[model samples]
Target: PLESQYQVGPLLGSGGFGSVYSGIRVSDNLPVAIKHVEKDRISDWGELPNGTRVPMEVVLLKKVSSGFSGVIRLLDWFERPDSFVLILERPEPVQDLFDFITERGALQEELARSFFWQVLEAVRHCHNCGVLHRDIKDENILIDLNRGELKLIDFGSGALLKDTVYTDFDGTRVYSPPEWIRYHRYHGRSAAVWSLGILLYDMVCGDIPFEHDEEIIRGQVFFRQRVSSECQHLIRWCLALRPSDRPTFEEIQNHPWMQDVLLPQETAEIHLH
Candidate 1:
């Protein structure tokens, strides 16, 4: 079915779990990212309401596939004898936020603020759909250069949202919250917020605030660039040593930094290069 309906092309990249290829729907020529995962590597499985079991990645994607533009869309999937092939939407003229930041050094506060809101909304949508995207970093987010929209990707480290603390960590260590690093346990929501803080810092400061475990535990942030006080305050709030001190999603959405908006004319003059 995959061969007849789609044509897999060049290798896009590989992750710990699978290899993704650029592909196209044979009939319509629609672009897609075809990911192939070995059966042996899939240790987690999730069940649908119809009692069908599939990879946790698929389950999580399907759970949040309700026409959310912030998240990548899953068009179709197939089961092979030795691996699973996933067909995903592939937006053109897009680059991961990591490279975007790397090439540009650091983003302006106003631009970073807009990107922050999109990512925050996407992560919130995932949580609302009962999924926890354990991995939240610049590398996992794709930025559309044309529209400046963000799409959160890579759910290979995702899990079903739960109230209990998670001890097992599959996400990037640099993005892990202090609680998980210190106590080896962290709640889903707070941990997500912590990574958000790290991401925001990475965008506006051109680097992650904490590179070492000691630094993360210390929870001290130093702005290398001339960041606004409100922006700095939000970053500090998110990077609080105590998880209880971190702002909730609602509070983050209502933060002064988030409320401040740049005029359309001013934003248009800002270049992406």
Candidate 2:
């Protein structure tokens, strides 16, 4: 048995790492998302504030959750004899961003604009907090259709940014920067920009920019459908071949395509209209 304090509910979802279940804190009947991982597959714990060596995923979530903007929060965790169960904050009626796109095919430009900014802001917040979500993909993002809210989840591919170069190959190949695929090395900011570009393309185009990793490496990008001039330019800008040429999140937020979207208050109007 995991624990008597919380009653496990249905399996919410699962990934390569393991499964996540909905649970209720018996004391307060508070709903939570519990992630279960087999002990044998668990990796090393990074250093914490007290210099306590803990699981990297746990430490990353603990540190990133501190700022708590646009990302999911990790509430508590428990250790089982065979596995590790991590309690996560659960907001009802949420679906993965990929599922949201799949249901609707693709999002309208204005709607895509709003959602993209949220993702951008979340990534920016994490970077400022000294973290790098090496794996940035639609599947890792969650959206609440009813409330028009977004939450970035799954820090298993994340790392504490201590150096400029990273050789870890944990992210999806399609979303990775060209340099990483070609040279086996890449910078944090540039790689993030590349993934953001892939995300933007996925949103409006309803498909990935490149059908194969080889094409992404060759920079063979061509938009299938006509997109807004600003949106097209923004996407191209993000997918730039040279890392130095790509815009930072700061520059991205100010782009005309992003500014054209509905405000936070207006985002709610999207579901209405």
Candidate 3:
């Protein structure tokens, strides 16, 4: 049996995919996080070109973990027909992105830029590695409790280039791209940029910059209000309804709204004494 690395204690949480346990590393006795991938029911971890199974989780985790220091490290993985194990780095009280927004009352301009830049860099790395990460969302993004760093995790529902876009109900509905809804070939980077834009709005305004209509609601009012309220003017190009209307990541990195922000130390934390 593969020993739990954290050497801390016992299991912490359980979810649809698997259960997480707390442990400590044997060598230095440092805290570690262990996620147990349950035995062969749904996703096969490492699948080969010829339709054989390998520890796919281990393979991707190894590749991604090493590239991004901000990302969680996949130290090692053990597989069995019934269950699997992932030995990982443990950070203090990781929180989802949503909680960050809720607690901060919209992101501080500098902080928003800080996290956003790191994420885009990570996404760029993913793109370079030829990984699509079709499922990019807050839940899949684990935030370091203390350092405010986000680790990209849960590559289960991801895909390569050819298998990128699908109509299946993979990601959250509101966050989904219109082209995806239409079953059309939307630019992956563009759609992902749009999502990042939405995420920016969330962090900057402490709310989603879109209408929550369950039915077909026409007109641009909802979109406009969002643009007017949040830091939308800065990221407007990314929010274009048509994918082609948006700019590339390179373009976004240069936008004024993004770069013009003064840090809290400089601006004295708006409305704070």
Best by lDDT: 1
Compared with the true structure, all predictions reach lDDT values of 0.88, 0.82, 0.62
Alpha-carbon RMSD, each predicted model: 2.0, 2.0, 4.5
* Cα lDDT of model 3 by residue, 1-273, tens digit: 465334657776777658888888887876777878766534535664575565555555555655566556777676666777778877666676766566667666666776676677777777666655655655666666555566776655555434244444354555656666555455567777767766666666676655453311221323322334335665666667677787788887777656654432333333222
TM-score of 3: 0.77
Residues 1-273 of candidate 2 have per-residue lDDT tens digits of 447788988998886768998888888988788898877766545766888545677887877776554888988876777877788888776788898788877678888898999898888888878888888889999876556767888887778876568877676888988899888998888899999999999999888888676898777668777789899999999999999999988899999888866664477566523
Model 1 ranges with Cα > 4 A deviation? 262-270
Candidate 3, residue 197: the lDDT equals 68
lDDT of 1: 0.88
User: Higher-TM-score candidate among 1 and 2?
Assistant: 1
Which regions of candidate 2 are displaced past 4 Å?
Answer: none
The clash tally of candidate 2 reads 2
lDDT of 2 at 107: 78
TM-score of every model versus the real structure: 0.94, 0.93, 0.77
Instruction: Show where candidate 3 strays beyond 4 Å.
Output: 4-12, 40-45, 48-56, 145-148, 162-169, 184-187, 210-230, 260-273
lDDT of 2 at 213: 66
What clash count goes with each model? 0, 2, 13
